[PDB]
Design a protein around this ligand. Structure first.
Ligand SMILES: [Ca+2]
Length: 318
């Protein structure tokens, strides 16, 4: 029907990616491209595997720019609507920066705009252990990464490179080089503006995230955390391995003062443009309806949220 029939094509920009160029990427936004298409959206999913950072000369941002130009040629459209998850939001920021006239909006879904405390933690472990692996938490993350992408003769080094880009230092510098009206003050834990007229082009800036992992009590110097997406004996804890894994990574973050997170990105780091909500009982993969659609008892429907938003865009005139 036309519910999600925006004026400009929607491009879904994945974040967690492997190193193999010749990879497969349709099922990252699990069940989302089809749903959007059923509602009239013209949806394209970018594959940016084999590129690490966004701002190189031969990086993800330039790749995505390429893809945006291809989609436009294929559709006879003049602008696109970028929706990005995790690093995907950061590289959507790059294209809008670099080519204002081709972008109608930039939406962020759990993007570590001010980095990740878990990514920070990992860089410290690697000072001592180059493999990471003596930390069970890191090892948990590596297996989750692997399940979401695949072993393609490896999971290990890709998993780690994925977090490299996302450290507080790294994003600090990125933002310095790639200013957006959508970002608030460093350290304020507030957003910027909902729009931005860059190069005669106004941009609709949106974001949302999930704060399923909540801190609880400090005893003996350590502060607990709770997953608030699950119910007691939740099957999602067995059926989906990322559920507890991201509670573990999320607990590390909490003990590095992140303070409410999806287990990878904290609430404050997530904020960009018009924040639709950060109240979702989601951990980092529930956001993309992931690990094959399993969510805890209290997690909202990822697919409805994104669809409602693509309709929002239709109503805003993009
Ligand atoms: Ca899940």
């Amino acid at each position: 029907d036309t519910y999600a029939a925006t004026r400009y094509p929607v491009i879904l920009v994945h974040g967690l990616a492997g190193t193999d160029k010749f990879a497969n990427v349709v099922d990252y936004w699990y069940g989302i491209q089809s749903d959007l298409q059923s509602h009239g959206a013209k949806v394209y999913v970018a594959n940016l595997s084999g590129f690490q950072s966004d701002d190189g000369p031969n990086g993800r941002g330039e790749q995505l720019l390429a893809y945006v130009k291809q989609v436009l040629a294929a559709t006879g459209a003049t602008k696109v609507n970028l929706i990005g998850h995790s690093q995907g939001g950061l590289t959507s920021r790059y294209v809008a920066a670099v080519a204002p006239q081709l972008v109608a909006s930039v939406t962020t879904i759990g993007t570590p705009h001010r980095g990740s405390e878990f990514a920070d933690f990992v860089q410290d472990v690697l000072k001592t252990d180059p493999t990471g692996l003596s930390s069970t938490v890191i090892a948990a993350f590596v297996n989750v990464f692997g399940t979401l992408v695949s072993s393609s003769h490896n999971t290990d080094q890709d998993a780690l490179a994925a977090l490299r880009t996302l450290t507080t230092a790294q994003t600090a510098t990125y933002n310095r080089n790639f200013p957006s009206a959508g970002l608030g003050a460093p350290g304020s834990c507030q957003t910027g503006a909902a729009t931005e007229t860059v190069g005669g082009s106004q941009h609709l800036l949106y974001s949302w995230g999930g704060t399923a992992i909540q801190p609880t009590s400090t005893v003996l110097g350590v502060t607990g955390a709770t997953d608030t997406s699950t119910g007691t004996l939740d099957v999602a804890n067995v059926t989906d391995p990322s559920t507890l894994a991201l509670l573990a990574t999320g607990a590390v973050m909490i003990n590095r003062a992140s303070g409410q997170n999806d287990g990878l990105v904290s609430r404050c780091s997530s904020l960009f443009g018009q924040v639709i909500s950060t109240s979702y009982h989601w951990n980092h993969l529930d956001e993309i309806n992931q690990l094959l659609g399993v969510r805890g008892a209290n997690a909202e429907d990822p697919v409805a949220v994104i669809r409602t938003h693509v309709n929002r865009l239709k109503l805003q005139g993009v």
